[PDB]
Design a protein around this ligand. Structure first.
Ligand SMILES: O=C(O)C[C@H](NC(=O)c1cnc2[nH]ccc2c1)c1ccc(Br)cc1
Length: 164
């Protein structure tokens, strides 16, 4: 049910789209959230996904952290997708603005390999401070499952396609 995606490789597809609107339309099995270790969904992709669930994602995440403690940078957990998807794979890419190791980006993308098909953003991009061109390269060289990337910014989308 994904449509209008540009094929980059055998298993990586990309589209200039708002990931919230794309999730509401497609209702995929898995939507990836650009999470932090605390599952505090304040801004960026995480804030936008949580707002679309009417804060139900935050309530569920706070119960998860109270039981399990924080995730690792490069780690993930599977929670409900609420009204946006069957499941949400919360994945923690390194946040370069908070001083985290960029080599953990490959570990973060490895979490996608546990799911046959996913709707996802580029990890560690945007407010996480990493170079999105680097993030797309690690994605294509690490994920073997079918990933549909939603890039919110039109100008960044055009730069990613032109330089791929
Ligand atoms: O989409 C991405 O590639 C990641 C990131 N997106 C958001 O922060 C983001 C924020 N608010 C949102 N409301 C609905 C979707 C949505 C996404 C981003 C990165 C670089 C630039 Br320039 C712009 C946006």
């Amino acid at each position: 049910s994904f449509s209008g995606y540009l094929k980059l490789t055998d298993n990586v597809y990309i589209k200039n789209a708002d990931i919230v609107e794309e999730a509401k339309k497609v209702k995929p099995t898995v939507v990836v959230n650009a999470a932090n270790v605390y599952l505090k969904h304040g801004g960026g992709v995480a804030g936008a996904l949580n707002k679309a669930t009417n804060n139900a994602m935050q309530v569920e995440s706070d119960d998860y952290i109270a039981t399990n403690g924080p995730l690792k940078v490069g780690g993930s957990c599977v929670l409900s997708g609420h009204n946006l998807a069957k499941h949400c794979l919360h994945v923690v890419g390194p946040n370069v603005n908070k001083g985290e190791d960029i080599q953990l980006l490959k570990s973060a993308y490895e979490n996608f390999n546990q799911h046959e098909v996913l709707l996802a953003p580029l990890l560690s991009a945007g407010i996480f401070g990493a170079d999105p061109i680097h993030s797309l390269r690690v994605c294509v060289d690490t994920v073997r499952t079918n990933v549909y990337l939603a890039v919110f910014d039109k100008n960044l989308y055009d730069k990613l396609v032109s330089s791929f």
